[PDB]
């Protein structure tokens, strides 16, 4: 007849609320760490969210489902492509499993370091803390008993002009200058 | 309980899902050897790699191409339904080494003769099967002729 | 936007393939493994049933094939079918006449191809 | 032929001999049971697919320790095969 | 390996694999009963089958 699955088991979430209540909606905002830009999700993004790839023709229900059965219920037959795609899906699983295994082996042998990132990265990035042990990172220890005061970020939107509407404030504000084009 | 969760404790590592967002031909050959070791050929490809330090050393160099996402191995054991008591070590110990493009071998000739050797092993399997049969039959005929004459 | 923020967890959605597929019974405890381990090892299409047999529609790997000439193995097996002089073809390691130009630094070029890369060739051909 | 969702029951069957090959026979029995009821309803008399699946069913019984069940079933297979037009040469072989 | 391409008869036809395992099982049984001529008859048959193939 007709088939609809988002899943391997055919299961799903309770697509409709109980009568008279409020619905749960998907977050409309694009998923981005910074709060400010605030973009809505793209068509593409919605396609990723709904469990396809970015395209209608891969990874979704629009792949995994047969195009046709026979009328009496006999199912269709295996393409070279269909088989190849199954091998792809298994290639992802083998990838995941193998990777995980490598991590577990490495940790078992104690090769998982306690210092985040590598040496190349640590020397690039002043975010990761100096992991120095028995000394204080910055000089000798601070005594136990605010940069914003003296540092000014004030972006001046409009540039203040010279007062031609006053005769004296015109001459007093004089900038003595000769403009020079580089040579 | 405002206290430290009493354990036996387990340590759980991570897994990098890496997706390549730019054409590798735009970039120098170093960045391409890195993108290769991350197993990423073209724009649009996606891979899963371990979180061990070498891999991070790689991702660090290509970070202006690749976009990355992390899963701790619990989250991963969930992402595919895997019973919690089954680790990944045994799951990996089960699956066949013969899985596609099995190895990393140094040159395309060596790759050729690796596949070649694979086939040859098949032939020798069926041949050795037949020969085993002939050996056993030879034995039955010898014990039969020896027990019949005697 | 071509800059798309979303976990790349979706670029590889696993909803269709859980471990149930590669390990068929993992909800029991037994870790049997059925993997289709390449695209190479595909056997071919096979009918589900006697009732709906596979249609015969050809590809270029069939629809274009010539008639069989007897090779050396066939005439060894059964000399009855060596009936004429055209069967007597020589060692199979004879390819044919030389069909092209061996052009220095470019391959074997084709006759009526590009002579753009023949300079060294033409000059080689006339002869501490 | 009467409609049966053969895709899902086939699915169910392949899961069945995954169970069998994996060494747990009772479950393969249950699964084959379902699939056999389905095919039994879906195909006419003595059709190849019927005798195939009840061969498998016989094999599942045998492994569980229901022996006379296996016996009876495999004899049904045979006297079915005889009554067929032109049976699969692989099926008579598998059967016996 | 395009020259050396090989396909095991135990796959591309299931019939031969079935009869093979058939005779294997059979021969085992004969070795337990203590029947020699049976065992030899059956092994020889199995061989002839394999090299027919």
């Amino acid at each position: 007849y007709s088939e609809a699955r988002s899943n391997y088991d055919g299961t799903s979430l309770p697509a409709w609320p109980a009568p008279g209540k409020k619905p749960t909606y998907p977050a409309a905002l694009s998923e981005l760490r910074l709060p400010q830009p605030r973009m809505r999700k793209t068509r593409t993004e919605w396609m990723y969210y709904h469990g396809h790839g970015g395209c209608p023709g891969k990874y979704g229900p629009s792949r995994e489902i047969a195009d046709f059965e026979y009328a009496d219920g006999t199912p269709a037959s295996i393409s070279g492509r269909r088989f190849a795609f199954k091998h792809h899906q298994d290639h992802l699983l083998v990838q995941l499993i193998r990777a995980a295994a490598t991590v577990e082996r490495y940790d078992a042998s104690g090769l998982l370091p306690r210092i985040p990132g590598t040496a190349e990265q640590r020397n690039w990035d002043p975010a990761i803390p100096l992991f120095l042990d028995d000394v204080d990172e910055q000089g000798r220890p601070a005594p136990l008993r605010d940069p914003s005061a003296f540092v000014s970020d004030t972006v001046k939107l409009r540039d203040d002009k010279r007062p031609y509407w006053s005769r004296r404030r015109w001459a007093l504000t004089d900038k003595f200058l000769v403009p020079k084009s580089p040579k | 309980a405002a206290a430290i969760a009493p354990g036996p404790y387990r340590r759980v590592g991570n897994i990098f899902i890496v997706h390549c967002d730019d054409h590798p031909f735009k970039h120098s050959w170093e960045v391409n050897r890195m993108l290769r070791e991350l197993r990423l050929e073209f724009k649009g490809q996606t891979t899963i790699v371990p979180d061990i330090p070498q891999v991070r050393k790689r991702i660090w160099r290509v970070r202006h191409i690749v976009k990355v996402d992390v899963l701790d191995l619990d989250e991963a054991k969930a992402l595919i339904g895997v019973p919690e008591h089954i680790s990944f070590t045994d799951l990996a110990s089960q699956l066949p080494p013969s899985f596609g493009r099995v190895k990393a071998v140094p040159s395309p000739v060596i790759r050729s003769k690796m596949n070649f050797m694979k086939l040859r092993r098949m032939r020798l399997r069926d041949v050795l099967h037949r020969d085993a049969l002939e050996l056993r039959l030879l034995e039955l005929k010898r014990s039969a002729m020896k027990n019949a004459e005697q | 936007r071509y800059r798309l923020f979303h976990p790349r967890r979706e670029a590889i959605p696993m909803h269709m393939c859980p471990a149930k597929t590669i390990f068929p019974l993992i909800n029991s405890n037994n870790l049997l493994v059925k993997t289709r381990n390449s695209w190479e090892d595909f056997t071919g299409r096979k009918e589900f049933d006697e009732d709906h047999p596979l249609p015969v529609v050809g590809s270029r790997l069939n629809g274009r094939t010539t008639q069989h000439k007897w090779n050396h193995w066939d005439q060894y097996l059964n000399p009855q079918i060596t009936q004429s002089i055209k069967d007597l073809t020589p060692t199979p390691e004879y390819v044919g006449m030389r069909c092209g130009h061996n052009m220095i630094k470019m391959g074997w070029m084709k006759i009526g191809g590009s002579w753009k890369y023949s300079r060294g060739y033409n000059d080689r051909r006339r002869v501490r | 032929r009467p409609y049966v969702p053969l895709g899902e029951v086939a699915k169910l069957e392949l899961q069945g001999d995954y169970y069998m090959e994996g060494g747990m026979f009772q479950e393969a029995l249950e699964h084959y049971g379902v699939v056999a009821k389905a095919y039994n309803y879906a195909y006419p008399e003595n059709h190849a697919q019927r005798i195939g699946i009840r061969i498998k069913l016989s094999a599942a019984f045998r492994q569980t320790g229901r022996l006379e069940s296996s016996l009876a079933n495999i004899e049904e297979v045979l006297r079915m095969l005889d009554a067929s037009t032109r049976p699969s040469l692989e099926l008579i072989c598998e059967a016996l | 390996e395009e020259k050396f391409v090989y396909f095991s008869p135990f796959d591309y036809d299931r019939t031969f694999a079935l009869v093979d395992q058939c005779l294997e099982r059979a021969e085992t049984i004969f070795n337990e009963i203590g029947d020699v001529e049976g065992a030899i008859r059956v092994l020889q048959q199995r061989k002839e089958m394999i090299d027919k193939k």
Binding site: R81, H91 | Q45 | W39, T43 | - | -
Partner: peptide, 29 residues
């Protein structure tokens, strides 16, 4: 170059993929 087959790869078309018929018992027997 060498292939990693990292993306999805359609298989090749090769002769062993021919659809082989099921040998049948003769009609009379």
């Amino acid at each position: 170059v060498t292939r990693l087959y990292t993306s999805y790869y359609t298989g090749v078309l090769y002769p062993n993929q021919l659809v082989q018929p099921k040998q049948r018992l003769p009609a009379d027997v």
